[PDB]
């Protein structure tokens, strides 16, 4: 819901950034 | 009232100081120093599964000449063409070298063979050479003592009159470069010591405060070094010389950063008019979380650096993180403790005069009132920095980055004096087929390969079974009876696998084999060698290419990919920490943009100064070290400044800017200049690569502190306004209070 | 006509295709020089002018 989503936007944003960074680093590493 | 942690730190000050001292003592007396423990367990710098390394191991395995890739050359020249006594002593020496099976694995006797002697002798018949395969890979100590042993065994016996013997190659080069760095250490340390003392007395205008800071820094450095050597001594974690050096540099930088942070905040608080106790409590409550966050961000980034594939960064991940954690722990426990003890006992930490805070408040006033034009000026300077970046070249030859008195350099000089190619850095090509090659048609194909290789733009010699002197430019015929001449059989073992399933040609470049062209040439060598067999029965065989240029091409590719991995990791972690600290999504983005822009401008200025003007090309390691240190220090300073700015927002956006400038700009500037000049004092070293790294970091921090951090980000903050703190809602000015 | 009277030189007379004074014609001469240099490489004429 709105409240439980906007009351914790920081941790979710960090999770998204870490996920993207991990995916990109994994893909680059295999080269 | 008073938080738990500072009260417990200060109440137990003396016992914790004693504990720190005794721990450092025990960790430094019972466990050797970092240089020794690092050298005993050094690791090879070439990746384990690179295309070149596998080729060298396989080539060694097939011909039964060891499993290593270290090699050296012996140069034999005289002022008169060599005679029979030359052969006599050459044979005696070669017997002696073959007697010592401990250190030399296998040998390549060309000059002793009449058929191939032409290919192992100068055009005027005045010089010769030999190849020795040595124990241990590159960079392991085994190679070092093996090359030293060969030097001793060759120099024990006196050469005949008229001739002189050298030792040459890459192994001797690395051994002597290690010795040269060790020699330069003393002078460089003396000069940097005097410069750092001068700078500290200049920043503080006192002798006692400088002495106390030196104490903080040395205790932190000794603790970090002892602890990391303790962990590495028991084979708990890996170590390497590059790791120890960068660890020392980072330890010094972080320790001085935090020491200046704490003492400056203390003195500022005292100047405001608070008593000793409240000054201590406010410095802790204003700097502790910043120090902790910066330390953990740097530790996390330097740990994430460990996923890299190139060992130069792989081995560098754990030890630096452990050292950084130790540094932050020491500077959070021991720091405030001794500050409290020193403040209480007598009268030592005492601010005198006030001339920097007022000046920096004035600079903040200028930034706030006219933020636009100052921004365009700063970005214009960054532009003049950036525009020289795209033209950037790099050189992998390490010969011409050292003084010319190293013995290997005289060996190289002799070789260049009597040879018109780069015959001291050859290569080897291999073809692995599935049938015996000791027959005529396969020889025609072999010669086809040799000729196809010879015709590449850059190659000068291609030494093969067909032509031992290395000029395959002729039509070929060898009747089958030639397999019975014993001399031909000896050459056959030298050049063909004993099973008959492999061939190898020795390829020597022209010019420097390690410049960019010498790196791009091996791909063409492989393509030509592949297309030469196309259509002949040998199709589908496996082609190996082992040599120095191959190794350096692999290293360059790994270098670019690892630089990008580390960049993404570091930048994303900076984003995370700024977001946690400020609770703003635009502020973190602005900081990320500014830091990357500063890296770019700094390196642009450095390349403008070092390659265009002084006419010396940068190394292939400067980028990595420079970016590591610059990113760490920038994270630290930006975190402090932004945290302070957030602290002073409540009374208006912009008077907060000028207050924050007065409070913290001076501290960050002092730390930046001290570290920058401590590094800049390295320009007088005779190991030019260290001069390059030191000067790059120095000029980079000068530009960062004096242009970017003091004029670009405060101006941006004052320009955007309340939109620097989105999504948080803030006000440009408080409610208008009455008179 | 071709060799030098003292016998220390030779000259070749080279004619282009199309328009010698367009961009390609200008670019061709470096290739000519490189080709000659690589042709003399390894032979007793190596390093000549």
Residue numbers in the entry:
A (entry chain B): 1 to 31
B (entry chain D): 20 to 493, 688 to 952
C (entry chain E): 707 to 755
List passages from the publication reporting this PDB structure.
Bedaquiline, an antitubercular drug that targets ATP-synthase, is a key component of a new oral drug regimen that has revolutionized the treatment of multi drug resistant tuberculosis. Clinical bedaquiline resistance in Mycobacterium tuberculosis has rapidly emerged, primarily due to mutations in the transcriptional repressor, Rv0678 that result in upregulation of the Resistance-Nodulation-Division (RND) efflux pump MmpS5/MmpL5 (MmpS5L5). Here, to understand how MmpS5L5 effluxes bedaquiline, we determined the structure of the MmpS5L5 complex using cryo-electron microscopy, revealing a novel trimeric architecture distinct from the canonical tripartite RND efflux pumps of Gram-negative bacteria. Structure prediction modelling in conjunction with functional genetic analysis indicates that it uses a periplasmic coiled-coil tube to transport molecules across the cell wall.
Structure-guided genetic approaches identify MmpL5 mutations that alter bedaquiline transport; these mutations converge on a region in MmpL5 located in the lower portion of the periplasmic cavity, proximal to the outer leaflet of the inner membrane, suggesting a route for bedaquiline entry into the pump. While currently known clinical resistance to bedaquiline is due to pump upregulation, our findings that several MmpL5 variants increase bedaquiline efflux may presage the emergence of additional modes of clinical resistance.
